[PDB]
């Protein structure tokens, strides 16, 4: 879910950044031709887009922090499952655990960290 | 006969109006029929379809306001950012004119937004630059989470959203839901997500999907997509290695060889682009791109008969343009075939669907005339080139040369000033203005013009002698 939300927000922010670049170029042209009204209009549009983008930036930053916490939690879980076993029976678990995440077999994953 | 069958058969035969015309009926008749639904969707999205590979119009904002190349000042010979301007016409300070305009041509890049604005709109792209690069179905009404479950509907629906409506965000939403429905095991959805990214601006996030799609199944499409991505990050030597890898997969692909040749010509080392276009010829022999490029290069390196052969080939393959026939006229005249020379220019003037094409044909007819003598006919042809395209700097320069041949110095000065104002990247108007000024005096104007000539064609000879004489007069 965090992954999908990050992807959506990234696409949205990319769209808004393209809008801002076009606006910057569009705004510059008005200034060059000395059309001050349309220049002020472009800068108002840029201000509004920047505020929207900063709101999206806060949202995306909080989501990314939560996702990094979740990833570190998953990896610490793998390491605490393997850490419970000495010698070779440790290594196996780790490998299996990773091979249980790339396949999303969560029940079998838990069975690897339960019995080994 | 039957509605669905006749509509689908219209679709197979690429009608694309009749198909929709019967499905619209068939949809008004039944509000619950998805076959005709997606068939009309296909027809609508294919009336306008154009493959994303050869659509690379960055415009102006991308050119300056977007920095993606890692190296800022890389070694000369590893970045994208022959005959001299005394033979081959030019478009910028360098970058001689090419054959086969494609909508991905950048042909140099501006330095600042002001320079890009205050220049002609079509001096850095095949089309004028842009700041940013009832209805059948309303995109805000359908739940993409339910069409993603049905791939047969999802594929045509994504093609519709992407190529007809140009809604990259909703297209990416649909493609993400579809890829997660397929458990990331079909290269097509990966390629489509990569395209969504690539035209959203995210290149690395697109290169990831293109690489992951190449790992699934090698296809020429994904190879060309990665080539675009790498060229966007200003990495020619990565794109060339990837192209040679693709040719190791597909031993004789024409698009890959043509991409290699395009990259070699952007880097401007023609001695390898000709080799790769010759490989394309050994494969295709009807390729308009390779034939046009080798023909132009053969014409400008004082071999107009071989270029005439290369263009008669395109004439033999049913190509019927204004450009092709003017080219045939130039070649026939300069290869000394005076029987088929002017009829080609007449067919050109007949086929010209513009006012700039007509002006270029009249310009070339004036060149023919001045090669024949009779400077009055060339005078008329240059004036008609001006009358057709007011911003035609070569016509101004040549008409000023003929005027100063007659004797009218002030007319020549004004016309050369106009030419050098329209096209500063050219060297002939500056050199001629400096020459006539120095002939009458005005060594300040002569210096200001000869220095711009040296800025335009820096390896000239007469410009150097002029600058030496001027700097000697200043002491």
Nearest CB neighbour to A28, from listed B113, B196, B205: B113
Please list every residue in chain A whose beta carbon sits closer than 8 Å to the beta carbon of residue B62. Answer: 21
Reduced to 3 states (helix: H, G, I; strand: E, B; else coil), residue B96 is: strand
| Chain B contact for A24 (CB, 8 A cutoff) | yes
Please list every residue in chain B whose beta carbon sits closer than 8 Å to the beta carbon of residue A19. Answer: 132
Instruction: Pick from B58, B112, B124, B131 the residue to mutate for testing the A interface (most A CBs within 10 Å).
Output: B131
Do B238 and B207 contact (CB within 8 A), yes or no?
A: no
Please list every residue in chain A whose beta carbon sits closer than 8 Å to the beta carbon of residue B172. Answer: 7, 11
Say how many C-beta atoms besides its own lie within 10 A of residue A8's C-beta: 16
C-alpha of B81 from chain center = 17
Q: What are phi and psi of B59, to 5 degrees?
A: 90, -125
C-alpha of B69 from chain center = 22
Q: Which of B280, B275, B228, B292 is nearest to B254 (CA)?
A: B280
Distance, CA of B460 to CA of B86 (rounded, Å):
8
Distance, CA of B275 to CA of A39 (rounded, Å):
51
| Chain A contact for B168 (CB, 8 A cutoff) | yes
Contacts of B356 (CB under 8 A, 6+ apart): B388, B389, B392
Do A24 and B61 contact (CB within 8 A), yes or no?
A: yes
Q: What are phi and psi of B90, to 5 degrees?
A: -125, 165
Reduced to 3 states (helix: H, G, I; strand: E, B; else coil), residue B136 is: coil
Which tokens hold the place of B13? 């035969």
Do B84 and B427 contact (CB within 8 A), yes or no?
A: no
Distance, CA of A51 to CA of A32 (rounded, Å):
26
Do B249 and B218 contact (CB within 8 A), yes or no?
A: yes
- C-alpha angle B230/B235/B238, rounded to 5°? 75
Nearest CB neighbour to B132, from listed A12, A18, A32: A18
**Closest CA of chain A from B409, distance in Å:** 35
Residue with token string 């991308």: B62
Elucidated via: cryo-EM
Q: Around B209, how many Cα atoms within 13 Å sit in the side-chain half-sphere? A: 25
Do B418 and B409 contact (CB within 8 A), yes or no?
A: no
DSSP states of B235-287:
-HHHHHHHHHHHHHHSTT-HHHHHHHHHHHHHTT-HHHHHHHHHHHHHH-S--
Q: Around B459, how many Cα atoms within 13 Å sit in the side-chain half-sphere? A: 8
Q: Around B27, how many Cα atoms within 13 Å sit in the side-chain half-sphere? A: 17
Name the burial class of residue B342, with classes exposed (0-12), middle (13-18) and buried (19+) by CB atoms within 10 angstroms of its CB. Answer: middle
Name the burial class of residue B13, with classes exposed (0-12), middle (13-18) and buried (19+) by CB atoms within 10 angstroms of its CB. Answer: exposed
Please list every residue in chain B whose beta carbon sits closer than 8 Å to the beta carbon of residue A12. Answer: 169
Between chains, do B201 and A29 touch, taking CB under 8 Å as contact? Answer: no
Which tokens hold the place of A93? 């678990």
Q: What b-and-e string marks burial along B430-459, b requiring 16 or more CB atoms within 10 Å of the CB?
A: bbbbbbbbbeeebbebbbebbbbbbebbee
Q: Around B385, how many Cα atoms within 13 Å sit in the side-chain half-sphere? A: 25
Q: Could you tell me how many helices (H) and strands (E) chain B has, helices first?
A: 25, 0
Do B121 and B295 contact (CB within 8 A), yes or no?
A: no
Residue with token string 């960055």: B58
B132 dihedral zone (left: phi>0; alpha: psi -120 to 50; beta): beta
Do B222 and B238 contact (CB within 8 A), yes or no?
A: no
Nearest CA in chain B to A5: B173
| Chain A contact for B132 (CB, 8 A cutoff) | yes
Nearest CB neighbour to B169, from listed A15, A22, A24: A15
Q: Is the dihedral of CA B252, B254, B256, B259 positive or negative?
A: positive
Q: DSSP character for B182?
A: T
Do B68 and B232 contact (CB within 8 A), yes or no?
A: yes
Which tokens hold the place of A24? 């910057």
Contacts of B435 (CB under 8 A, 6+ apart): B446, B462, B466
Q: Which of B177, B132, B175, B131 is nearest to B156 (CA)?
A: B175
Distance, CA of B456 to CA of B450 (rounded, Å):
10
C-alpha of B411 from chain center = 36
| Chain B contact for A8 (CB, 8 A cutoff) | yes
Please list every residue in chain B whose beta carbon sits closer than 8 Å to the beta carbon of residue A103. Answer: none
């Amino acid at each position: 879910e965090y992954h999908s939300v990050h992807q959506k927000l990234s696409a949205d922010m990319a769209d808004n950044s393209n809008l801002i670049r076009s606006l910057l170029v569009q705004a510059e042209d008005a200034r060059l031709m000395r059309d001050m009204k349309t220049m002020k209009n472009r800068y108002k549009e840029l201000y509004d887009l920047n505020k929207d983008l900063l709101n999206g930036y806060k949202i995306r930053c909080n989501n990314h922090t939560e996702l990094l916490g979740s990833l570190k939690a998953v990896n610490q879980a793998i390491q605490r499952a393997g850490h419970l076993r000495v010698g070779k029976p440790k290594n196996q678990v780790i490998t299996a655990c990773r091979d249980a995440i790339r396949s999303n077999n969560i029940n079998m994953l838990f069975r690897i960290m339960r019995v080994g | 006969m039957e509605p669905l069958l006749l509509a689908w058969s219209y679709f197979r035969r690429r009608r694309f109006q009749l198909c929709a015309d019967l499905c619209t009926q068939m949809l008004e008749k039944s509000p619950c029929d998805q076959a005709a639904w997606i068939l009309k969707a296909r027809a609508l999205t294919e009336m306008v379809y154009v493959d994303e590979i050869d659509v690379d119009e960055e415009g102006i904002a991308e050119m300056i306001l977007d920095e993606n190349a890692i190296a800022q000042v890389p070694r000369p010979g590893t970045s994208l950012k022959g005959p001299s301007p005394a033979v081959r016409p030019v478009t910028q300070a360098g970058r001689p004119i090419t054959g086969f305009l494609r909508p991905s041509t950048q042909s140099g890049r501006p330095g600042t937004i002001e320079q890009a604005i205050k220049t002609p709109r079509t001096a850095y792209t095949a089309r004028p630059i842009a700041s940013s690069s009832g209805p059948f179905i309303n995109l805000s009404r359908l739940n993409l989470a339910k069409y993603a479950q049905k791939p047969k509907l999802a594929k045509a629906l994504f093609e519709y959203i992407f190529h007809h409506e140009n809604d990259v965000k909703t297209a990416l939403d649909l493609a993400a839901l579809s890829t997660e429905h397929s458990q990331y095991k079909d290269w097509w959805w990966k390629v489509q997500i990569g395209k969504c990214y690539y035209r959203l601006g995210l290149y690395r996030e697109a290169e990831k999907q293109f690489k992951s799609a190449l790992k699934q199944q090698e296809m020429v499409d994904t190879f060309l997509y990665l080539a675009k991505v790498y060229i966007s990050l200003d990495q020619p030597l990565t794109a060339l290695n990837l192209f040679k890898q693709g040719l190791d997969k597909f031993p004789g692909e024409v698009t890959l060889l043509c991409g290699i040749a395009r990259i070699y010509e952007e880097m401007n080392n023609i001695s390898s682009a000709t080799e790769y276009y010759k490989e394309v010829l050994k494969q295709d022999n009807t390729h308009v791109e390779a034939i046009a490029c080798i023909g132009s290069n053969h014409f400008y390196t004082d071999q107009p008969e071989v270029a005439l052969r290369f263009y008669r080939r395109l004439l033999q393959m049913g190509v019927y343009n204004c450009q092709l026939f003017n080219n045939l006229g130039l070649c026939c005249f300069y290869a000394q075939q005076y029987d088929m020379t002017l009829t080609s220019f007449e067919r050109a003037l007949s086929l010209a669907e513009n006012e700039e094409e007509v002006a270029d044909v009249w310009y070339n007819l004036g060149h023919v005339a001045v090669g024949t003598g009779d400077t009055n006919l060339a005078h008329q042809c240059f004036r008609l080139a001006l009358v057709s395209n007011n911003q035609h700097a070569e016509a101004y320069n040549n008409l000023a040369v003929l005027e100063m041949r007659r004797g009218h110095v002030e007319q020549a000065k004004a016309l050369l000033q106009t030419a050098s104002s329209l096209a500063p990247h050219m060297y002939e108007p500056h050199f001629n203005f400096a020459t006539i000024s120095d002939k009458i005096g005005d060594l300040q104007r002569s210096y200001a013009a000869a220095k711009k000539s040296e800025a335009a064609f820096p390896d000239h000879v007469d410009t150097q002698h002029l600058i030496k004489q001027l700097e000697q007069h200043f002491a």
